[PDB]
C-alpha cells in the first residue's frame, strides 16, 4: 500500500470513521463458529477510539442473501455482541444500514461510538445484482454515516461492490488488517518455495473455478477438491456425480484448463474415491463412491475418500510452499470431515519440515480453529478468494479505490 492512504497517516481526531470490514463470519445452529475475522478488525477500531475518532460505524456483508432482507438467517447482530467482548467496549446495532433512521444514528454520535449497521447486502444496491439511480443513492447514504472511510475488510476486497468501492469521501483509507495481509502476500507471492502447491476445494464453485486459468501461471501443482472436483470429474471421466455441486458455466472451460495445466507442467489432483450422502444434512444417511463406480442418483459427494486423501498427502510432501483455500469436504458435520481432517494433518507436518503453509478463508480458516492448528502453519488468512486473487496477481478493487497518497 505504499501508493496509498493508511490508517496510520488518517487523522482521526473528532472524526466519524465509517469503515467496511468482512464481518462475513462462519455459523451453525444460529451461533458464531469463528470469530477470527471480527477479532482481526480490532486492531484498526481501537486505533480509532484511541486516537480520538467521534464515531467509528462498521459495514459488512453475512453470507449471500442476495438483495432481500433475511433477518432471521442472515443478520450481523450476533457480531455486535461478539465484537463487545473483543473490543472491552459497546456496540450499537442498528437494524438496517442506510437511509432516514441510519443516518440520523450515525449523524452526530457521542463520541467514542461504536456502531454496527445490519447485512449491506439485504439491500440488491451493494452487488447490486441478485439499477443505477438507486446504487448511486445507496453509495450516498453509507457515505454520509462517516467524515472519512476505512477498507479493513481484505476478506471482501476481492468484490467491486458499493461498499467496498463505491464509498465518496475525500479520505480512503486502507486498515491494519489489510495491511497485514498484503504486505505477507507480497513477501511470500514475491519469489515463491518450489513446488508450489495451490489447494482449491470449498463450495464456490461458479466463482472459483474462473480463478483456476491465472492460477496456473503461477503455481507448480493443484489439488482440486471437495465442491470443486466434481464439475471435473463429469467433464473429464464421464462420472455420474447424482447431486453433487455441478457449475454448468465451469464445465465448458474444464478441458481447456488441463490443457493449459499440461503446457504448464502443472499436475492436477483430483479425487478418486468419495464419502456420500442421500441429502445436504449433517444427519444424511451415507455411503462411499469411486470414479468408476459413479454416484448414484440423488447422492452427493461431502468429502474425498481414503485414496484420495493419500493422493493429497503425496502431492503435499512435494511442496516446499502451500496456498490452501477451501475445505475438501463438508468439515463442519463430521460425517465429512476425515478428509479435511487428514489433509490438515499432513499440512501441518509439511510446515515442521520447514514447507511455508498459508491457509485462508472465512470457512478455511475454521478448519485451523476446529483441529487447534492455528500456529501450526505459517500464515492463516482472513482472505478466501481474496487470497487467490492475489495469487492470480491481481491488484483487488477494494485495494484500488482507496486514495492515493
Ligand atoms: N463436496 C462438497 N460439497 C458441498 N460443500 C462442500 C464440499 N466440500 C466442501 N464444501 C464446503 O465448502 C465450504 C467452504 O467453501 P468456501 O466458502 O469457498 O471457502 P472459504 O470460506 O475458505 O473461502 C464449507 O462450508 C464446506 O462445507
Ligand atoms: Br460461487
Ligand atoms: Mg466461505
Request: hydrophobic letters at 40%; charged letters at 25%; aromatic letters at 6%.
Given at each position: 500500500?505504499?501508493?496509498?492512504?493508511?490508517?496510520?497517516?488518517?487523522?482521526?481526531?473528532?472524526?466519524?470513521?465509517?469503515?467496511?470490514?468482512?464481518?462475513?463470519?462462519?455459523?451453525?445452529?444460529?451461533?458464531?463458529?469463528?470469530?477470527?475475522?471480527?477479532?482481526?478488525?480490532?486492531?484498526?477500531?481501537?486505533?480509532?477510539?484511541?486516537?480520538?475518532?467521534?464515531?467509528?460505524?462498521?459495514?459488512?456483508?453475512?453470507?449471500?442473501?442476495?438483495?432481500?432482507?433475511?433477518?432471521?438467517?442472515?443478520?450481523?447482530?450476533?457480531?455486535?455482541?461478539?465484537?463487545?467482548?473483543?473490543?472491552?467496549?459497546?456496540?450499537?446495532?442498528?437494524?438496517?444500514?442506510?437511509?432516514?433512521?441510519?443516518?440520523?444514528?450515525?449523524?452526530?454520535?457521542?463520541?467514542?461510538?461504536?456502531?454496527?449497521?445490519?447485512?449491506?447486502?439485504?439491500?440488491?444496491?451493494?452487488?447490486?445484482?441478485?439499477?443505477?439511480?438507486?446504487?448511486?443513492?445507496?453509495?450516498?447514504?453509507?457515505?454520509?454515516?462517516?467524515?472519512?472511510?476505512?477498507?479493513?475488510?481484505?476478506?471482501?476486497?476481492?468484490?467491486?461492490?458499493?461498499?467496498?468501492?463505491?464509498?465518496?469521501?475525500?479520505?480512503?483509507?486502507?486498515?491494519?488488517?489489510?495491511?497485514?495481509?498484503?504486505?505477507?502476500?507480497?513477501?511470500?507471492?514475491?519469489?515463491?518455495?518450489?513446488?508450489?502447491?495451490?489447494?482449491?476445494?470449498?463450495?464456490?464453485?461458479?466463482?472459483?473455478?474462473?480463478?483456476?486459468?491465472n492460477?496456473?501461471?503461477?503455481?507448480?501443482?493443484?489439488?482440486?477438491?471437495?465442491?470443486?472436483?466434481?464439475?471435473?470429474?463429469?467433464?473429464?471421466?464421464?462420472?455420474?456425480?447424482?447431486?453433487?455441486?455441478?457449475?454448468?458455466?465451469?464445465?465448458?472451460?474444464?478441458?481447456?484448463?488441463?490443457?493449459?495445466?499440461?503446457?504448464?507442467?502443472?499436475?492436477?489432483?483430483?479425487?478418486?474415491?468419495?464419502?456420500?450422502?442421500?441429502?445436504?444434512?449433517?444427519?444424511?444417511?451415507?455411503?462411499?463412491?469411486?470414479?468408476?463406480?459413479?454416484?448414484?442418483?440423488?447422492?452427493?459427494?461431502?468429502?474425498?475418500?481414503?485414496?484420495?486423501?493419500?493422493?493429497?498427502?503425496?502431492?503435499?510432501?512435494?511442496?516446499?510452499?502451500?496456498?490452501?483455500?477451501?475445505?475438501?469436504?463438508?468439515?463442519?458435520?463430521?460425517?465429512?470431515?476425515?478428509?479435511?481432517?487428514?489433509?490438515?494433518?499432513?499440512?501441518?507436518?509439511?510446515?515442521?519440515?520447514?514447507?511455508?503453509?498459508?491457509?485462508?478463508?472465512?470457512?478455511?480458516?475454521?478448519?485451523?480453529?476446529?483441529?487447534?492448528?492455528?500456529?501450526?502453519?505459517?500464515?492463516?488468512?482472513?482472505?478466501?478468494?481474496?487470497?487467490?486473487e492475489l495469487?492470480e496477481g491481481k491488484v483487488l478493487?477494494?485495494?484500488?479505490?482507496?486514495?492515493?497518497?
Amino acid at each position: 500500500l505504499s501508493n496509498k492512504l493508511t490508517l496510520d497517516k488518517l487523522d482521526v481526531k473528532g472524526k466519524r470513521v465509517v469503515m467496511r470490514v468482512d464481518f462475513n463470519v462462519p455459523m451453525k445452529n444460529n451461533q458464531i463458529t469463528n470469530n477470527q475475522r471480527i477479532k482481526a478488525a480490532v486492531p484498526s477500531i481501537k486505533f480509532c477510539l484511541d486516537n480520538g475518532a467521534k464515531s467509528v460505524v462498521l459495514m459488512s456483508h453475512l453470507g449471500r442473501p442476495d438483495g432481500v432482507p433475511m433477518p432471521d438467517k442472515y443478520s450481523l447482530e450476533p457480531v455486535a455482541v461478539e465484537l463487545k467482548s473483543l473490543l472491552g467496549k459497546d456496540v450499537l446495532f442498528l437494524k438496517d444500514c442506510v437511509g432516514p433512521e441510519v443516518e440520523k444514528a450515525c449523524a452526530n454520535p457521542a463520541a467514542g461510538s461504536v456502531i454496527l449497521l445490519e447485512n449491506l447486502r439485504f439491500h440488491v444496491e451493494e452487488e447490486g445484482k441478485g439499477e443505477p439511480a438507486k446504487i448511486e443513492a445507496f453509495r450516498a447514504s453509507l457515505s454520509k454515516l462517516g467524515d472519512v472511510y476505512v477498507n479493513d475488510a481484505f476478506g471482501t476486497a476481492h468484490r467491486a461492490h458499493s461498499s467496498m468501492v463505491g464509498v465518496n469521501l475525500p479520505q480512503k483509507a486502507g486498515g491494519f488488517l489489510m495491511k497485514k495481509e498484503l504486505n505477507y502476500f507480497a513477501k511470500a507471492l514475491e519469489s515463491p518455495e518450489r513446488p508450489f502447491l495451490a489447494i482449491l476445494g470449498g463450495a464456490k464453485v461458479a466463482d472459483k473455478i474462473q480463478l483456476i486459468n491465472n492460477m496456473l501461471d503461477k503455481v507448480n501443482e493443484m489439488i482440486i477438491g471437495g465442491g470443486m472436483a466434481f464439475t471435473f470429474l463429469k467433464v473429464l471421466n464421464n462420472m455420474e456425480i447424482g447431486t453433487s455441486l455441478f457449475d454448468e458455466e465451469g464445465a465448458k472451460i474444464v478441458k481447456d484448463l488441463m490443457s493449459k495445466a499440461e503446457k504448464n507442467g502443472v499436475k492436477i489432483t483430483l479425487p478418486v474415491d468419495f464419502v456420500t450422502a442421500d441429502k445436504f444434512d449433517e444427519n444424511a444417511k451415507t455411503g462411499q463412491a469411486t470414479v468408476a463406480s459413479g454416484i448414484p442418483a440423488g447422492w452427493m459427494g461431502l468429502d474425498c475418500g481414503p485414496e484420495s486423501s493419500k493422493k493429497y498427502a503425496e502431492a503435499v510432501t512435494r511442496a516446499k510452499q502451500i496456498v490452501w483455500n477451501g475445505p475438501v469436504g463438508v468439515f463442519e458435520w463430521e460425517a465429512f470431515a476425515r478428509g479435511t481432517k487428514a489433509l490438515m494433518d499432513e499440512v501441518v507436518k509439511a510446515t515442521s519440515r520447514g514447507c511455508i503453509t498459508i491457509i485462508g478463508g472465512g470457512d478455511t480458516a475454521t478448519c485451523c480453529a476446529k483441529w487447534n492448528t492455528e500456529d501450526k502453519v505459517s500464515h492463516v488468512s482472513t482472505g478466501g478468494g481474496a487470497s487467490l486473487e492475489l495469487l492470480e496477481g491481481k491488484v483487488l478493487p477494494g485495494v484500488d479505490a482507496l486514495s492515493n497518497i
